[PDB]
Structures are given as C-alpha cells and as structure tokens.
A paper describes a structure:
[name] is broadly implicated in various diseases, including cancer, autoimmune disorders, neurodegeneration, and rare monogenic diseases. In this work, we use an orthosteric [name] activator and inhibitor from the same chemical series to discover that [name] M271 is a critical residue for molecular activation. The M271CH3 NMR chemical shifts reveal a unique molecular signature for pharmacological or genetically driven activation and inhibition that is not able to be resolved by other biophysical methods. We show hydrophobic interaction in this region plays an important role in regulating [name] activity.
Numbering used by the authors:
A (entry chain A): 153 to 228, 238 to 317, 323 to 338
B (entry chain B): 153 to 185, 194 to 226, 238 to 303, 305 to 316, 322 to 336
Amino acid sequence: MSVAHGLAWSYYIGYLRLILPELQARIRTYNQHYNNLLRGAVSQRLYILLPLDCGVPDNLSMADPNIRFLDKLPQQRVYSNSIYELLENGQRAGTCVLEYATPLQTLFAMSQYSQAGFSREDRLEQAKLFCQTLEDILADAPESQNNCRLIAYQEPFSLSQEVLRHLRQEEK
Amino acid sequence: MSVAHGLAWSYYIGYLRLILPELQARIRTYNQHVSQRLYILLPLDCGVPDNLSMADPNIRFLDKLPRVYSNSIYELLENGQRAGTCVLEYATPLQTLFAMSQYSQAGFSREDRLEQAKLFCQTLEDILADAPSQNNCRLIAYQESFSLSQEVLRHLRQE
Ligand SMILES: CCn1nc(C)cc1C(=O)Nc1nc2cc(C(N)=O)cc(OC)c2n1C/C=C/Cn1c(NC(=O)c2cc(C)nn2CC)nc2cc(C(N)=O)cc(OC)c21
C-alpha cells in the first residue's frame, strides 16, 4: 500500500541518491590508503539490512557477536557509513559497509502507536512492499543499483551468515 | 492518504522525538551563555529552498544552536529592526513530496502533492498533540505580497 511507497521514495530521495554515487570512490580510497595492509579489501557496495519483522536494534555489534565494527569510511549535511568484519569460527570471513534500512523502524513504531491505525499484519505487508518499491527504484536509479545490495530476511538464525551468503553470491 | 501518514510518522520517530526532549535545555544554554520552541515551516506547495536567508531577506541567520543534530537560529527583521529571534527550519518530508511529484516512477501528481502536504500537516499535528514535543515545537503552515518573516512573527506574537 501507499505507506511503504512513501517511505521507500523518502529513503531514496533524502538519503540513498545522495550517498550511493560517491560510495564506490570512498570504498576505493579506504582500501588503497586507510585499510591495514594485513587485511582483506573491504567489499564494494552498501549492504542494506532489511529485517522483515522490522526489528531494527540500536547497536549492530550487540545484535550478533560475529559482526564486529572496524572503522568509519572517509566522510562524504554529512554521512557516517560504518565498515564491519564478519567472523566465521573466529576467523575474519568478510568485510563490508553495512547498515539497517531505518524506515523499517518507522513501520515498527507505527504498528505500536494506536493513533497510526496500523496493525502488526499491516507492518509485515508494508515491510515487504517497502523492499519491493525500493528494489524497483534502485533497478532504474542512475549510479545506485551497482553500488548497493538489499538483504531481506525473516527470523524465528545467524545475521553474520546471512550477510556472508550475499557477499559470496556476488563473488561466485 | 497513506504516503503523508508514513512521512509524518517517519519525521517524528526518526527526528522530532529525538531532538525535542532536549531542545528546551539547548535553547536555555544559548540564552544564558532566542524564543523557546522549534518553529517548523510547512509550505503547503512543498517549495522548500536550500537557503532560508535567500527565500526572504528579512530572515537572517544568526548562529547554530550548540548522532549530531544542527539547528539554526534566525533573526526576523521588520522595517530593518530586529522584531524576533527563533530556532527555525523547514519540514524536510515536504521536499520528498515535491520530488515524488517530479519523478514519473513515483506515480504522484501535483494535485496528489497538495493533498498529501495538507494530510502530512494534519497527521504531524495529531502525533505532536499527544507526544510526550508539543510544548517544544510549533507548526507554521502557509500558502505562498506574501512575507515569510511576517508569517513567523505572527505565530511568535500569538504565543
Ligand atoms: C530523510 C531520508 N529518510 N527517509 C526515511 C523514510 C528514512 C530516511 C533516512 O534513513 N535518512 C537518513 N539516514 C541517514 C544516515 C546517515 C548516516 N549513515 O550517518 C546520515 C543521514 O543524514 C544526516 C541520514 N539520513 C538523513 C536524515 C536523517 C535524520 N534527520 C532528519 N530526518 C528527516 O527530516 C526525516 C524526514 C522523514 C520523512 N523522515 N525523517 C527521519 C529520518 N532530519 C534531520 C536534520 C538534522 C539536522 N538538524 O542537522 C539531522 C538529522 O539526522 C542526523 C536529520
């Protein structure tokens, strides 16, 4: 329905269209001049986490102990994008720029506030339609699809393995 | 109906609920070491310019109010004299409604933009009426001779 439609368009206009054109250059700059020489290159593309239950925690490292914060990307009013290391059996298995799609926090809060007239069933339906609309916007957005990946997932699960699966899919 | 609903809720959850509880203390700190309340400009035609001072010469930037949130303090001039001073800013979700009316893929008409701008104001007013936020902010809705400085001064004198 139209709630998800407006949120996906807002997320694109007010944020993704402003950060994705220069993201590739920032990632290259970090790999060439800031990344520790004993580390693997940070993967290209912004990985956007889309929990379908709209459960967006405040700390990304507290959600999963295998997602460890590493550094902030060189800055692009201003935007702070974080680089995370994904651990598998203690070893570093991948490194990427990761963050939650914040409009799903709004969908969660709307399902909690009575005045919003928004059910928990409406939340799940609108979360899926938010992902659909955002995927359609990014499919034809100039310099945005090849610079980001949408990670949609449902929970009853390892969030670190969910991100690693998408990273290995791009490599294969 | 629902585009405006989602934007008003997003503006509250992702921004106003995080800045309005501590705004009164930041305003007091500036005065001790500018009127209370955040004045949110809501142009119903969704014409949000990038520079506030360029929109009206009688609205002059004075200083920034000390996640990082930067709010700007402005002086409102009347016949050259300083007639009021307040923390002022545009409701940025109206810039999204304007852009949606411009992008073909959004399937959003200019008529849909005016309807959704009014419903955004209505939903935001209802949220703020019962948010634990109302006494720390005021909504200035207007349709653009028109003077934006006089529009803000009218609300300041009403309080
Ligand atoms: C608007 C795009 N959007 N739409 C949906 C749906 C979700 C998002 C979204 O995810 N936005 C987003 N993510 C970011 C991540 C980073 C990063 N990685 O560091 C940096 C960012 O920009 C600084 C990010 N932004 C931009 C805005 C962030 C919050 N914010 C707002 N927000 C709104 O007005 C608004 C309008 C509607 C509708 N909903 N909201 C609430 C979000 N006004 C602010 C004013 C000031 C100030 N006074 O200086 C400071 C702010 O926050 C520091 C302000």
